[PDB]
Amino acid sequence: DGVGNSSGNWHCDSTWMGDRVITTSTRTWALPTYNNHLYKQISSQSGASNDNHYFGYSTPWGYFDFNRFHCHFSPRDWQRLINNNWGFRPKRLNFKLFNIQVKEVTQNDGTTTIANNLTSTVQVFTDSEYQLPYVLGSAHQGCLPPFPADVFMVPQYGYLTLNNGSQAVGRSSFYCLEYFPSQMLRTGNNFTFSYTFEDVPFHSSYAHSQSLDRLMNPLIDQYLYYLSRTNTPSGTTTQSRLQFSQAGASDIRDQSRNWLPGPCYRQQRVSKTSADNNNSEYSWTGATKYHLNGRDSLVNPGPAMASHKDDEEKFFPQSGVLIFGKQGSEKTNVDIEKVMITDEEEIRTTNPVATEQYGSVSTNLQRGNRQAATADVNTQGVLPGMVWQDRDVYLQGPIWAKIPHTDGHFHPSPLMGGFGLKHPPPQILIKNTPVPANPSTTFSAAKFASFITQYSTGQVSVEIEWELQKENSKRWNPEIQYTSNYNKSVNVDFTVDTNGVYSEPRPIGTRYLTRNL
Amino acid sequence: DGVGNSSGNWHCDSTWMGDRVITTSTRTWALPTYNNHLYKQISSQSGASNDNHYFGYSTPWGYFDFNRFHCHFSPRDWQRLINNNWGFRPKRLNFKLFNIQVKEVTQNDGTTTIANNLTSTVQVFTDSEYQLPYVLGSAHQGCLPPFPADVFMVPQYGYLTLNNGSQAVGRSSFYCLEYFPSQMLRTGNNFTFSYTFEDVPFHSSYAHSQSLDRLMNPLIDQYLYYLSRTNTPSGTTTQSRLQFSQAGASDIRDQSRNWLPGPCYRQQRVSKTSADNNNSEYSWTGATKYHLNGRDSLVNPGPAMASHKDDEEKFFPQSGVLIFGKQGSEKTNVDIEKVMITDEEEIRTTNPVATEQYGSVSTNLQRGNRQAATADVNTQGVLPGMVWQDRDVYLQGPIWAKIPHTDGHFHPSPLMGGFGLKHPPPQILIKNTPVPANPSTTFSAAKFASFITQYSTGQVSVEIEWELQKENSKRWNPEIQYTSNYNKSVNVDFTVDTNGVYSEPRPIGTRYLTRNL
């Protein structure tokens, strides 16, 4: 209402009550004019490799992105969550846009001037029928910034469709976003909508205190037998004789078991110590990849697998983990001290190590003159009796992904981590309404190319309720907790420096508490 | 209300429910000051030919024009309409103007500055009594642009009255539009009105799968007789003897029939291949024309006739079809690759080909010493028993025309195509209210010639409900559908390019489905 009344108030806090936590984040955003109000066909450059070809469209619209956990949880909030809860999941969200300001920019005479345009509008619509290509869930920049005092730029919306090389095909779709209905907002108007999450499984924010190969009573023998010797000493040599034993603690690898470890898709191993790696360019040639319509894509991060085995923390899968950048890290070819490499070590209780074989299978039929032969299994699809953990989530990491619209999707938990949703939180798209500049006094049928330079700013609030599954642990000894480091330092972790720059010093997962298998 | 509240929201979409479809289009418009607020007498230049003389008036007003199908239907919407429906017609419309902004322009010191004038008005009125000359329905530029992201200039209103040469006559009428009541709108005011279409016949969006000369059972003979031989061999010569046959499939051209093809007004034939045409200037001398009060007018497109016969797709009538320009085509003397020539081939089942004779009639009375003589019929008025199809409509083409206010009008379907309406959607005229600049401090009776430079912009919505007649076809074999081309291409049809320019690559008619006669 009017011009002198704010359309909303600042809400940032977390409310912990019972099995629920509610997070609220308010930020200040700025929206420019994109593409000078045009839709543009875009494509890969002429010299691009086949694996890098694309075709699509850039739009004049922007969109809002709060699909990272930091956007909602403070570092102290994240600690409170991960130290006390076995699981959590999102329930509902609220979204608000308010305190909208449109401003005119006159760059005349090399001097910039900025004035309020109290009459201009912004257009906002939710894609609640999921009729546009969903580009959230691709881990793009442009989120609400983790620190509440920071002002962020709204990212530009674009999408890809079917390409053959740099060219489109008959099935390529083009979308005009102005062909949707949208709200027009003038200074003093606000925008709200609500969303309910579908029923989704809790994220498992625990590690297992048991391993899948150690589930039996070590004090008692099995009543089942296994083949323990295939020959026996006969005089001066051996002869073929099959012999059988019941497995106890002494031969614990040989016990009959009910379950199998999860599936595998083997990754190459790289060392954080530089001298242990081969002196060669293998970042692509040695990469784990999939092949789709004659194209190779890197499998990154791929299926959830343990980063390393015991005492090998310096090793990680080539493209098998999420890697976050440190504050101020650049885009291209940075050193390893500039990035933060997550560790999925916790899931090695049930999941194969990413850089090892799944196991060994028999390849032949032995006999008197043929010895038994085995082969390493480097790729293992799911088997009946397999169990596994999903990838962990991080404070820096994504929250949800849209499950692709397909006939079949096995265990549709997104591989970068988080909650797979058939109807995710809808895309919220926004743009400044074009305001034409001074027209000619003689009619012209050509479209207007001359506009008044404008941008918008405002406040955005996002409120998410999360359902908690509290830890109820009967173990006697104390557990592992996330804690801040104990010593003195120049800067405090998760703080601003003397220049006002907020930084996140390390990745924080969720799995600190333990449970039995 | 106020200054900080938008007076409306953006509505673009199509709603298909039952036998109805509702289209909504929102666009952004800009309105300049025309004629520096004056009415001006206008006329043809002194050296103009008699056929080109005119007299009339240009006004300071603008008007809104949504009389093209693209203004309402998206290309995908048009496909959905034409592939599934035997007919459609308009039922009612809604029109909105909202988010009005008046702006002052100061061009002082060679520097332009643009500021909001929150106090100035625009004037808007509908001519709902049809008391002004109706210039819609003359296929003028200035429509709402087909692509929703484009901003368009409001065209200037003008009209013609009776002329003798470049001079007026006693019966010439002058109209002051400010002699009508109109709404005055300030920033925060909006304008709405509703309109109901009269009962109008459905457009036939089908082609016929039968021809008017092939309607009989080919297996059975007729019981009627025709004169099949007028002489018979007699000795060494012939003698006059009248003989009669019943017509079957073997002589199917001779069968007695109930109906005649539609009327004709013959056009000259031109080839799309350049070498087949005469090397001469015949675009006017060879043109089909009518003569009104000593003036010649080109007949364009004229009566609905088939563009060509079988296997002659390269031929078209000289002025007998609608010709649309390709994106970026110019005004004067463009090549044939710059224009799109429609094809009315579908109606050759019932309508004469535009470039052929209607038929042959007898011209004399034969006898022993006089042979029978016939003549080609190059112009045929309507006869009892004639049937015909009207011209097709196009996505680029016009929708309605105003039926002229006359004593008699046979089959008042407009010749450029679409719906003839005795009370068409009324003209919506708009202009900026003049705001005088700084006056003298001594009184002067002279009229003000000095004003503040202003223009206006806003949003316009148009919503039309269409009644559908669904295809209910019992044929066994599959039909013809409009489809997008199958192959790869640089650009997609009906899309923007890399520079943001929307284009319409071809004309699309309505007649893909078939029906029996």
Short mmCIF file of C-alpha atoms in Angstrom, two decimals, chain A residues 115-450:
data_model
loop_
_atom_site.label_atom_id
_atom_site.label_comp_id
_atom_site.label_asym_id
_atom_site.label_seq_id
_atom_site.Cartn_x
_atom_site.Cartn_y
_atom_site.Cartn_z
CA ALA A 115 16.40 8.02 -9.11
CA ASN A 116 13.33 6.22 -7.83
CA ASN A 117 10.67 5.32 -10.37
CA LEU A 118 7.61 4.92 -8.18
CA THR A 119 5.45 3.78 -11.11
CA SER A 120 7.43 0.90 -12.61
CA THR A 121 6.68 -2.75 -11.93
CA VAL A 122 8.39 -6.07 -11.52
CA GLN A 123 6.79 -9.27 -12.79
CA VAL A 124 6.83 -12.39 -10.62
CA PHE A 125 5.37 -15.83 -11.19
CA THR A 126 5.79 -19.29 -9.74
CA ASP A 127 6.01 -22.23 -12.12
CA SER A 128 3.75 -24.38 -9.99
CA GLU A 129 2.77 -26.75 -12.82
CA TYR A 130 6.46 -27.42 -13.59
CA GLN A 131 5.95 -26.41 -17.21
CA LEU A 132 9.38 -24.79 -17.58
CA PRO A 133 12.76 -26.55 -17.62
CA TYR A 134 13.83 -26.93 -14.00
CA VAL A 135 17.36 -25.58 -13.58
CA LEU A 136 17.37 -25.65 -9.82
CA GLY A 137 19.09 -28.75 -8.58
CA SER A 138 22.07 -28.30 -10.90
CA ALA A 139 24.29 -26.77 -8.17
CA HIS A 140 24.50 -23.29 -9.66
CA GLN A 141 25.76 -20.14 -8.02
CA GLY A 142 23.38 -17.34 -7.18
CA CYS A 143 21.94 -18.65 -3.93
CA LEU A 144 20.83 -16.48 -1.08
CA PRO A 145 24.18 -15.72 0.58
CA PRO A 146 24.99 -17.64 3.77
CA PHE A 147 25.72 -14.53 5.77
CA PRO A 148 22.59 -12.45 6.42
CA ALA A 149 24.20 -9.02 5.96
CA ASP A 150 25.23 -9.70 2.36
CA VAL A 151 23.35 -8.38 -0.67
CA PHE A 152 23.12 -10.71 -3.64
CA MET A 153 22.43 -10.41 -7.35
CA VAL A 154 19.53 -12.37 -8.81
CA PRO A 155 20.83 -14.92 -11.35
CA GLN A 156 19.69 -14.94 -14.96
CA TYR A 157 17.40 -17.75 -16.09
CA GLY A 158 18.23 -19.89 -19.10
CA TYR A 159 17.68 -23.42 -20.27
CA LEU A 160 18.82 -26.05 -22.74
CA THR A 161 16.84 -28.19 -25.15
CA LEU A 162 17.72 -30.93 -27.63
CA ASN A 163 20.81 -30.24 -29.73
CA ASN A 164 22.53 -31.90 -32.65
CA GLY A 165 25.93 -30.29 -32.54
CA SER A 166 25.30 -26.57 -32.11
CA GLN A 167 21.97 -26.89 -33.94
CA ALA A 168 18.44 -27.55 -32.76
CA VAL A 169 16.28 -30.48 -33.84
CA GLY A 170 12.57 -30.81 -34.56
CA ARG A 171 11.83 -31.74 -30.96
CA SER A 172 13.54 -28.64 -29.52
CA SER A 173 11.18 -26.53 -27.42
CA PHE A 174 11.16 -22.78 -27.00
CA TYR A 175 9.43 -21.15 -24.03
CA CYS A 176 8.21 -17.57 -23.76
CA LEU A 177 7.88 -16.86 -20.06
CA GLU A 178 5.60 -13.89 -20.67
CA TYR A 179 3.13 -16.48 -21.96
CA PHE A 180 2.51 -17.32 -18.34
CA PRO A 181 0.37 -15.21 -16.00
CA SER A 182 2.41 -13.26 -13.48
CA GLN A 183 1.93 -10.70 -10.73
CA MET A 184 2.95 -7.11 -11.41
CA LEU A 185 4.36 -5.37 -8.34
CA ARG A 186 4.83 -1.64 -7.78
CA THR A 187 6.61 -0.09 -4.78
CA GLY A 188 4.41 -1.05 -1.85
CA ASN A 189 3.22 -4.36 -3.26
CA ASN A 190 4.43 -7.66 -1.89
CA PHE A 191 4.49 -11.24 -3.11
CA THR A 192 3.86 -14.39 -1.09
CA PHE A 193 3.31 -18.07 -1.68
CA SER A 194 3.34 -21.29 0.31
CA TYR A 195 4.55 -24.77 -0.54
CA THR A 196 4.18 -28.17 1.11
CA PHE A 197 6.86 -30.80 0.66
CA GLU A 198 5.80 -34.29 -0.33
CA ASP A 199 6.40 -37.16 2.05
CA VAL A 200 10.12 -37.85 1.80
CA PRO A 201 12.39 -40.14 3.79
CA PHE A 202 14.43 -38.58 6.56
CA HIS A 203 18.05 -37.95 5.76
CA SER A 204 20.16 -40.31 7.85
CA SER A 205 22.33 -37.94 9.89
CA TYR A 206 24.15 -40.77 11.67
CA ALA A 207 27.02 -43.12 10.96
CA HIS A 208 26.86 -46.83 11.66
CA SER A 209 28.75 -48.26 14.62
CA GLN A 210 28.66 -51.70 13.00
CA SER A 211 29.98 -52.98 9.70
CA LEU A 212 27.95 -55.24 7.44
CA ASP A 213 30.61 -57.97 7.57
CA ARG A 214 30.66 -57.88 11.40
CA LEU A 215 27.09 -58.58 12.53
CA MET A 216 27.35 -61.98 14.20
CA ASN A 217 27.89 -63.05 17.81
CA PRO A 218 31.68 -63.55 18.06
CA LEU A 219 31.27 -66.06 20.90
CA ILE A 220 29.15 -68.67 19.10
CA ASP A 221 29.88 -70.81 16.06
CA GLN A 222 27.59 -71.12 13.07
CA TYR A 223 25.74 -74.34 12.39
CA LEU A 224 26.28 -73.89 8.64
CA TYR A 225 29.35 -75.23 6.85
CA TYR A 226 31.64 -73.76 4.23
CA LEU A 227 34.22 -75.41 2.00
CA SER A 228 37.50 -74.84 3.84
CA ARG A 229 39.95 -77.16 2.07
CA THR A 230 39.89 -78.50 -1.48
CA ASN A 231 42.90 -80.80 -1.20
CA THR A 232 44.70 -82.72 1.51
CA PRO A 233 48.28 -84.02 1.83
CA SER A 234 48.49 -87.53 0.39
CA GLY A 235 51.84 -89.21 0.88
CA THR A 236 54.40 -87.05 -0.91
CA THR A 237 51.84 -84.83 -2.67
CA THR A 238 48.24 -83.65 -2.31
CA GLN A 239 45.04 -85.18 -3.61
CA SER A 240 41.66 -83.60 -4.29
CA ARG A 241 39.51 -83.86 -1.16
CA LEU A 242 36.70 -81.47 -0.25
CA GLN A 243 36.51 -80.53 3.42
CA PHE A 244 34.06 -78.41 5.36
CA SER A 245 34.09 -76.31 8.51
CA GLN A 246 31.70 -74.32 10.64
CA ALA A 247 32.79 -70.68 10.82
CA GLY A 248 33.51 -69.05 14.16
CA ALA A 249 35.48 -65.99 15.26
CA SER A 250 38.78 -67.46 14.07
CA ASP A 251 37.57 -67.55 10.45
CA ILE A 252 35.13 -64.67 10.54
CA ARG A 253 35.54 -63.81 6.84
CA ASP A 254 34.00 -67.18 5.92
CA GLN A 255 30.69 -66.85 7.75
CA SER A 256 27.37 -67.23 5.99
CA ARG A 257 25.70 -63.82 5.84
CA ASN A 258 22.33 -62.41 4.81
CA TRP A 259 23.26 -59.15 3.10
CA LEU A 260 25.47 -57.59 0.46
CA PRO A 261 27.14 -54.18 0.24
CA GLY A 262 25.64 -51.56 -2.03
CA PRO A 263 26.36 -51.06 -5.72
CA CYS A 264 29.60 -49.80 -7.20
CA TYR A 265 30.85 -47.80 -10.18
CA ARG A 266 34.59 -47.67 -9.79
CA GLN A 267 36.49 -44.38 -9.54
CA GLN A 268 40.19 -43.66 -9.99
CA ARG A 269 42.15 -42.84 -6.85
CA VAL A 270 44.07 -39.57 -6.42
CA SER A 271 46.33 -38.58 -3.51
CA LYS A 272 46.26 -35.25 -1.73
CA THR A 273 50.04 -35.58 -1.49
CA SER A 274 51.24 -34.44 -4.91
CA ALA A 275 54.15 -36.87 -5.26
CA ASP A 276 51.99 -40.02 -5.14
CA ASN A 277 50.16 -39.21 -8.38
CA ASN A 278 51.21 -40.08 -11.91
CA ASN A 279 52.93 -37.35 -13.90
CA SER A 280 50.51 -37.24 -16.83
CA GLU A 281 47.19 -35.74 -17.94
CA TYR A 282 44.55 -38.25 -16.88
CA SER A 283 41.81 -35.96 -15.53
CA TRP A 284 39.64 -36.91 -18.52
CA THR A 285 41.25 -40.04 -20.00
CA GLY A 286 41.21 -41.72 -16.59
CA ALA A 287 37.82 -40.35 -15.59
CA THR A 288 34.70 -42.33 -14.79
CA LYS A 289 32.14 -41.61 -17.45
CA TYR A 290 28.81 -42.40 -18.93
CA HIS A 291 27.82 -42.36 -22.58
CA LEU A 292 24.55 -40.80 -23.76
CA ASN A 293 23.63 -40.31 -27.42
CA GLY A 294 27.25 -40.45 -28.53
CA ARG A 295 28.44 -38.07 -25.81
CA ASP A 296 30.63 -38.67 -22.78
CA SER A 297 29.72 -37.09 -19.46
CA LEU A 298 31.86 -37.17 -16.35
CA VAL A 299 30.20 -39.15 -13.56
CA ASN A 300 30.37 -36.62 -10.77
CA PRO A 301 29.95 -37.36 -7.90
CA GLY A 302 28.22 -40.55 -9.00
CA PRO A 303 26.90 -43.33 -6.78
CA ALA A 304 27.48 -43.02 -3.05
CA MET A 305 30.69 -44.84 -2.17
CA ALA A 306 33.25 -44.54 0.60
CA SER A 307 36.00 -42.03 -0.17
CA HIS A 308 38.81 -44.23 1.17
CA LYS A 309 39.47 -47.18 3.42
CA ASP A 310 41.10 -47.20 6.86
CA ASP A 311 44.19 -45.02 7.28
CA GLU A 312 43.99 -43.73 3.69
CA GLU A 313 42.43 -40.31 4.35
CA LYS A 314 44.86 -38.74 1.86
CA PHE A 315 43.15 -40.60 -1.00
CA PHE A 316 39.87 -39.60 -2.62
CA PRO A 317 37.96 -40.64 -5.75
CA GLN A 318 38.84 -38.61 -8.84
CA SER A 319 35.29 -37.36 -9.44
CA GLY A 320 33.59 -39.20 -6.57
CA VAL A 321 33.13 -36.48 -3.92
CA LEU A 322 31.75 -32.98 -3.63
CA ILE A 323 34.46 -30.32 -3.68
CA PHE A 324 33.70 -26.87 -2.32
CA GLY A 325 35.79 -23.77 -2.85
CA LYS A 326 37.33 -21.75 -0.08
CA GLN A 327 36.33 -18.11 0.25
CA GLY A 328 37.74 -16.15 -2.66
CA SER A 329 38.68 -19.16 -4.77
CA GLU A 330 38.65 -18.66 -8.52
CA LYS A 331 36.96 -20.46 -11.38
CA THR A 332 39.75 -22.18 -13.31
CA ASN A 333 42.62 -24.50 -12.34
CA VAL A 334 43.09 -23.62 -8.69
CA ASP A 335 45.43 -25.46 -6.35
CA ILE A 336 44.23 -28.06 -3.88
CA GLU A 337 44.74 -25.62 -0.99
CA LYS A 338 42.03 -23.46 -2.58
CA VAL A 339 39.32 -26.13 -2.41
CA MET A 340 37.67 -28.23 0.29
CA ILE A 341 37.30 -31.95 -0.45
CA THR A 342 34.51 -33.71 1.42
CA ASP A 343 35.04 -37.13 2.97
CA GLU A 344 32.38 -39.84 2.64
CA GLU A 345 34.39 -42.19 4.89
CA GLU A 346 31.45 -42.82 7.24
CA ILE A 347 29.51 -45.07 4.86
CA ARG A 348 32.24 -47.68 4.42
CA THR A 349 30.32 -49.82 6.92
CA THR A 350 27.83 -50.67 4.16
CA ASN A 351 29.11 -49.07 0.97
CA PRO A 352 32.07 -50.16 -1.17
CA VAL A 353 35.08 -47.87 -1.27
CA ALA A 354 34.83 -45.78 -4.43
CA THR A 355 38.32 -46.68 -5.69
CA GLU A 356 38.26 -50.44 -5.09
CA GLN A 357 36.59 -53.38 -6.78
CA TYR A 358 33.22 -54.53 -5.53
CA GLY A 359 34.56 -58.06 -5.23
CA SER A 360 35.53 -61.15 -7.18
CA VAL A 361 33.50 -63.59 -9.25
CA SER A 362 34.38 -66.94 -10.77
CA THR A 363 35.02 -66.85 -14.51
CA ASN A 364 35.52 -70.48 -15.52
CA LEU A 365 34.64 -74.09 -14.77
CA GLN A 366 37.53 -75.75 -12.98
CA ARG A 367 38.43 -79.43 -13.26
CA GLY A 368 41.40 -81.78 -13.00
CA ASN A 369 43.37 -79.87 -15.63
CA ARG A 370 41.89 -76.36 -15.16
CA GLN A 371 42.51 -74.16 -12.13
CA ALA A 372 39.80 -71.86 -10.84
CA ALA A 373 39.98 -68.28 -12.10
CA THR A 374 38.38 -65.13 -10.68
CA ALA A 375 37.90 -61.59 -11.94
CA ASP A 376 37.57 -58.23 -10.22
CA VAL A 377 34.12 -56.65 -10.37
CA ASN A 378 34.59 -52.97 -11.21
CA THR A 379 30.91 -52.19 -11.84
CA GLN A 380 28.11 -53.85 -9.89
CA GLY A 381 24.45 -53.18 -10.41
CA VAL A 382 22.03 -53.65 -7.56
CA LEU A 383 21.41 -57.18 -6.29
CA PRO A 384 18.68 -58.57 -4.03
CA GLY A 385 20.02 -58.32 -0.50
CA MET A 386 22.12 -55.18 -1.04
CA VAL A 387 21.98 -52.40 1.53
CA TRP A 388 23.57 -48.97 1.32
CA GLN A 389 23.62 -45.44 2.65
CA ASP A 390 22.97 -42.37 0.55
CA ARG A 391 25.48 -39.57 0.22
CA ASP A 392 25.68 -37.12 3.11
CA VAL A 393 24.44 -33.54 2.98
CA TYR A 394 26.49 -30.48 3.85
CA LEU A 395 25.86 -26.99 5.16
CA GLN A 396 27.36 -25.71 1.89
CA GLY A 397 25.55 -28.36 -0.15
CA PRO A 398 22.26 -28.64 -2.01
CA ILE A 399 18.98 -29.55 -0.35
CA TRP A 400 16.63 -30.95 -2.99
CA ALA A 401 16.55 -32.04 -6.61
CA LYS A 402 13.70 -32.58 -9.05
CA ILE A 403 13.18 -36.25 -9.85
CA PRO A 404 13.22 -36.51 -13.67
CA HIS A 405 9.87 -37.15 -15.31
CA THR A 406 10.40 -40.70 -16.56
CA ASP A 407 8.82 -44.14 -16.65
CA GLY A 408 11.35 -45.63 -14.26
CA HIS A 409 13.73 -44.28 -11.64
CA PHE A 410 15.32 -46.62 -9.13
CA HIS A 411 15.88 -45.18 -5.64
CA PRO A 412 15.50 -41.58 -6.81
CA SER A 413 17.75 -40.02 -4.20
CA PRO A 414 19.82 -37.33 -5.97
CA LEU A 415 23.47 -38.21 -6.36
CA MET A 416 24.87 -34.86 -5.26
CA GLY A 417 22.89 -35.43 -2.05
CA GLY A 418 19.61 -34.40 -0.51
CA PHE A 419 15.93 -34.97 -1.10
CA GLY A 420 14.54 -36.20 -4.39
CA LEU A 421 11.19 -34.57 -5.06
CA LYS A 422 8.72 -35.31 -7.82
CA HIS A 423 7.24 -31.85 -7.16
CA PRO A 424 10.09 -29.74 -5.80
CA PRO A 425 9.77 -26.16 -4.56
CA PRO A 426 8.73 -24.34 -7.72
CA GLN A 427 10.90 -21.90 -9.62
CA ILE A 428 10.23 -18.26 -8.73
CA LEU A 429 11.02 -16.10 -11.74
CA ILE A 430 11.27 -12.32 -11.73
CA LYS A 431 12.06 -9.53 -14.16
CA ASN A 432 11.77 -5.77 -14.50
CA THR A 433 8.97 -4.68 -16.81
CA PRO A 434 10.46 -2.86 -19.82
CA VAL A 435 9.67 0.85 -19.88
CA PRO A 436 10.11 2.36 -23.35
CA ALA A 437 12.03 5.60 -23.75
CA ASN A 438 10.92 8.62 -25.79
CA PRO A 439 9.22 7.40 -28.98
CA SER A 440 9.15 9.07 -32.36
CA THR A 441 6.18 11.27 -33.20
CA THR A 442 5.67 9.44 -36.51
CA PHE A 443 4.34 5.90 -36.23
CA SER A 444 6.73 3.03 -36.82
CA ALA A 445 5.84 -0.65 -36.90
CA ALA A 446 9.34 -1.72 -35.84
CA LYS A 447 9.61 -3.01 -32.29
CA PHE A 448 11.03 -0.70 -29.64
CA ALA A 449 14.75 -1.09 -29.06
CA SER A 450 15.22 1.96 -26.81
#
